[PDB]
């Protein structure tokens, strides 16, 4: 989530070991570091253009993505820089040779290089434990809005 200030916290927010010498005059101010996570996920332009820090970002942060890659649909954007997605699936019950609708909710950290809205399908990828719950990080938004500007006024 984030959204502005960049510097609002009791501690100075910076990237580790990325030094900008004040002696050497630079027209970009701060030097910024990033990477590609792998697996083909485009490291989005809002990460390289951005001023945010987020050491939990898969591009500009210190986390690696490895293990499961999953997709779910965004059910909650409430807590800061993290969301909950619902993943449905049908569970096969052999005696009745039929299925039942089930789901799980996966808490996942989302860098403020993505603007996530509720309802978005999102591609998410696994992580070292980021928090008590979050084991995953949002690596791609496969949705958009689902007809947001088609919600407008009359003739």
């Amino acid at each position: 989530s984030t959204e502005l200030t960049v510097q609002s916290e009791r501690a100075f927010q910076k990237q580790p070991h990325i030094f900008n010498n004040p002696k050497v005059k630079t027209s970009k101010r701060t030097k910024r570091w990033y990477k590609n996570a792998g697996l083909g996920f485009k490291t989005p332009k809002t990460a390289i253009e951005g001023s945010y820090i987020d050491k939990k970002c898969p591009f500009t942060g210190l986390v690696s993505i490895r293990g499961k890659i999953l997709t779910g649909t965004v059910v909650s954007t409430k807590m800061h820089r993290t969301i909950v997605i619902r993943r449905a699936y049908l569970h096969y019950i052999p005696k009745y040779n039929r299925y039942e609708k089930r789901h799980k909710n996966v808490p996942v950290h989302v860098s403020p290089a993505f603007r996530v809205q509720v309802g978005d399908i999102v591609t998410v990828g696994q992580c070292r434990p980021i928090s008590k719950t979050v084991r995953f990080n949002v690596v791609k938004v496969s949705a958009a809005a689902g007809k947001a500007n088609k919600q407008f006024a009359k003739f």
Partner: protein
């Protein structure tokens, strides 16, 4: 459970050992060593259950304590010592040399080899990194470290090893179409030359195989061990040459060879 486990129960021991169910309880627990516990042949299982040379295990320690036995040229007094794939077992007395290599049933076979072939071995390089002080090194499936290898030597390539000395004399790049020995899976012990490799970033590359009967199969790259070129291997293969006939085909060969 509070620390390292020192025992092995029978039925817990791997099945390619061919240990009988009864006559006691436990199995020999392979010592820490060059080869993984679950793929290995402790010296006792070899010198006894295969070669029938000693009846006890109490006898098997009498053999090794005279230093008859030597593994890959060093002596090796350890009863449960984890001998493994590509290792050379030499009995000084009885002039005998072996190389540990796989059946098509996945079992280690007694395989006798020439005195002169017994002085070299094939490692598969598992990893190659840049070590202390800029010295690049290579390490092989059996846990050897060879410092200063050829730059061209990459992971999954195999390596010829001097035994007597340590050094790498030659290597074989991992290449479409090279003689391959499966170590793992149910295709363990088949020998198939490499059709082509499935990539799979994120894990588990697959290596497609076609043996000299024009049968095909797949395994995971981890189970593929390069031995050479189609036709010419770099080691003496065991009888059957890792082909794997069907139950039918094998029932016929064994019942066609009959007349006394």
């Amino acid at each position: 459970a509070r620390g390292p486990k020192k025992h092995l129960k029978r039925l817990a021991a791997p099945h390619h050992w061919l240990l009988d169910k009864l006559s006691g309880c436990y199995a020999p627990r392979p010592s820490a060593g060059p080869h993984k516990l679950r793929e290995s042949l402790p010296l006792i299982v070899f010198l006894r259950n295969r070669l029938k040379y000693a009846l006890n295990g109490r006898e098997v320690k009498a053999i090794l304590m005279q230093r008859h036995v030597k593994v890959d040229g060093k002596v090796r007094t350890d009863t449960t010592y984890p001998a493994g794939f590509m290792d050379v077992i030499t009995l000084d007395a009885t002039n005998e040399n072996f190389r540990l290599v796989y059946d098509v049933k996945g079992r280690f076979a007694v395989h006798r080899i020439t005195d002169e072939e017994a002085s070299y071995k094939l490692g598969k390089v598992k990893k190659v990194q840049l070590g202390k002080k800029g010295v690049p090194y290579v390490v092989t499936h059996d846990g050897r470290t060879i410092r200063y290898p050829d730059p061209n030597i990459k992971v999954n390539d195999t390596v010829k090893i001097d035994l007597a000395s340590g050094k790498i004399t030659d290597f074989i790049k991992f290449d479409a179409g090279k003689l391959v020995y499966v170590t793992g899976g149910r295709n363990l012990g088949r020998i198939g030359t490499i059709v082509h490799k499935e990539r799979h970033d994120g894990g588990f590359d697959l290596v497609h195989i076609k043996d000299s009967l024009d049968n095909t199969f797949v395994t995971r790259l981890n189970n593929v061990f390069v031995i050479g070129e189609q036709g010419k291997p770099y080691i003496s293969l065991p009888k059957g040459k890792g082909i794997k006939l069907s139950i039918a085909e094998e029932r016929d060969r064994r019942r066609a060879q009959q007349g006394l």
